[PDB]
Design a protein around this ligand. Structure first.
Ligand SMILES: Nc1ncnc2c1ncn2[C@@H]1O[C@H](COP(=O)(O)OP(=O)(O)O)[C@@H](O)[C@H]1O
Lengths: 88, 269
C-alpha cells in the first residue's frame, strides 16, 4: 500500500509587471568577492585538467553533485496565455 | 652588454665602447661591467666577420689603457670561461677570475631568507626543506620561487579585501602570511635553469651512514686527513703523501658513501 501522488493542479496568469525591473548604475562594477572567487575558479579549471588521477578520484568529485532530486513539477504553456502546472 | 654593442653599426660599436671607458674615467673612481663577455669579445679565431674581430682588438686596447685611467676597474661576466678570446687573460687586463658556480643547499637557504626579508611567513613554512628540494636552482629561480609564493598568498586573501584603487591598507598587507602550501605550489611551477651543470658541494654523507667497513674508514682518514693534520711527521720521515686510492670489489657495497663520508668529515667539496 502506497499513497497516490496528488497532481495539485494549478493554473496561473502571468502579469506584465513581473518583468519590470531597473538596475542601479553600479550593478556592472565587479566586486572584490567576484574577483577573488572568479580568479580561484580560473586556477582550479587549469589544475583540474593538469592533475594525474585515476577514475576513482574523478568519481569522488563528480559523485557529490548527483543525488538531490526524485520528483518533478511540470508546466504547460497554452495558446490562450494560461499557464497550467501539476506534480509528477 | 655584448648584445647592445653588437647591435651597433660598424664604427659605432667601437666608438660607443670607447666612450664608456672615457666616461668612467671622468667619473672615477668607477667600475665598468661588461655583461656577456663571450658575446662582445668572442674568440677571434672562431669568427670570420671583420667587425667581430675588430671589437676584440678595441676592447683589448681599452683594457690596456687602464694603466692611464686612474681608479677604474673593469668587471665582466660570462657563462663559460672558455668562450672568450684568451688574449683577455694576459697579465693586467682580466688577470683575476672568480668562479661563482651554483649555490649549494646552504647557499640556497640563504637566498630564500634574503628574498623573504619583507615576507611574513606562517609557522608551517620550512625554508630549509625548500632549499633541499630545489636541486639545480640558482638565485634567479629561488627569487622567482619566493615571488610566486607571494602572489599565491595574495590571491587567496587580499583579492577579497583590496580596492580597485592605487593604494592598499597597510594593515591588510601586514596581516598576510605565506604558508608552506604556497611554497609547495610555487615549487611545482618553478623550473631549474641550471640542472645539467655539475654541482660541487660538501656532501652530507657522514660515517654514521656506512655500516661495517671499520678498517676502510680508518684507512681513508690516514690517506686524506693525516697529510695535513700531521705534516711534520711526513716531513720527518721524508714521505710523499699518496695522491689517491682505487676501490674495487662487488657493486653495492658502499664505495660511493666511502668517498663522500671522508669528504664530509674533512669539510671538503
Ligand atoms: N656499507 C653500507 N652501509 C650502508 N648502506 C650501504 C652500504 N653499502 C651499500 N649501501 C647502500 O647501497 C646503495 C648503493 O651504494 P653505492 O656505493 O652507490 O653502490 P654503487 O656505487 O655500486 O652503485 C647506497 O645507496 C647505500 O644506501
Amino acid at each position: 500500500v502506497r499513497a497516490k501522488l496528488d497532481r495539485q493542479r494549478r493554473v496561473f496568469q502571468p502579469s506584465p509587471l513581473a518583468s519590470q525591473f531597473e538596475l542601479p548604475g553600479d550593478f556592472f562594477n565587479l566586486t572584490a568577492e567576484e574577483i577573488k572567487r572568479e580568479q580561484r575558479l580560473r586556477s582550479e579549471a587549469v589544475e583540474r585538467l593538469s592533475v594525474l588521477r585515476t577514475k576513482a578520484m574523478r568519481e569522488k568529485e563528480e559523485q557529490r553533485g548527483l543525488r538531490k532530486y526524485n520528483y518533478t513539477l511540470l508546466r504547460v504553456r497554452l495558446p490562450d496565455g494560461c499557464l497550467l502546472q501539476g506534480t509528477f | 652588454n655584448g648584445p647592445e654593442i653588437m647591435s651597433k653599426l660598424a664604427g659605432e660599436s667601437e666608438s660607443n665602447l670607447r666612450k664608456a671607458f672615457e666616461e668612467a674615467e671622468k667619473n672615477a673612481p668607477a667600475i665598468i661591467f661588461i655583461d656577456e663577455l663571450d658575446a662582445i669579445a668572442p674568440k677571434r679565431e672562431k669568427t670570420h666577420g671583420e667587425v667581430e674581430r675588430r671589437i676584440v682588438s678595441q676592447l683589448l686596447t681599452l683594457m690596456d689603457g687602464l694603466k692611464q685611467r686612474a681608479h677604474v676597474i673593469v668587471m665582466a661576466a660570462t657563462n663559460r670561461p672558455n668562450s672568450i678570446d684568451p688574449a683577455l687573460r694576459r697579465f693586467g687586463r682580466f688577470d683575476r677570475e672568480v668562479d661563482i658556480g651554483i649555490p649549494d643547499a646552504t647557499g640556497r637557504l640563504e637566498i630564500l631568507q634574503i628574498h623573504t626579508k619583507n615576507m611574513k611567513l606562517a609557522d608551517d613554512v620550512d625554508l630549509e626543506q625548500v632549499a633541499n628540494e630545489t636541486h639545480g636552482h640558482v638565485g634567479a629561480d629561488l627569487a622567482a620561487l619566493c615571488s610566486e609564493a607571494a602572489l599565491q598568498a595574495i590571491r587567496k586573501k587580499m583579492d577579497l579585501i583590496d580596492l580597485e584603487d592605487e593604494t592598499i591598507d597597510a594593515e591588510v598587507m601586514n596581516s598576510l602570511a605565506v604558508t608552506m602550501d604556497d611554497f609547495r605550489w610555487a615549487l611545482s611551477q618553478s623550473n631549474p635553469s641550471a640542472l645539467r651543470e655539475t654541482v660541487v658541494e660538501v656532501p652530507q654523507v657522514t660515517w654514521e651512514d656506512i655500516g661495517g667497513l671499520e678498517d676502510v674508514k680508518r684507512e681513508l682518514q690516514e690517506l686524506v686527513q693525516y697529510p695535513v693534520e700531521h705534516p711534520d711527521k711526513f716531513l720527518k720521515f721524508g714521505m710523499t703523501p699518496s695522491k689517491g686510492v682505487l676501490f674495487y670489489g662487488p657493486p653495492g657495497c658502499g664505495k660511493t658513501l666511502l668517498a663522500k663520508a671522508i669528504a664530509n668529515e674533512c669539510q671538503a667539496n
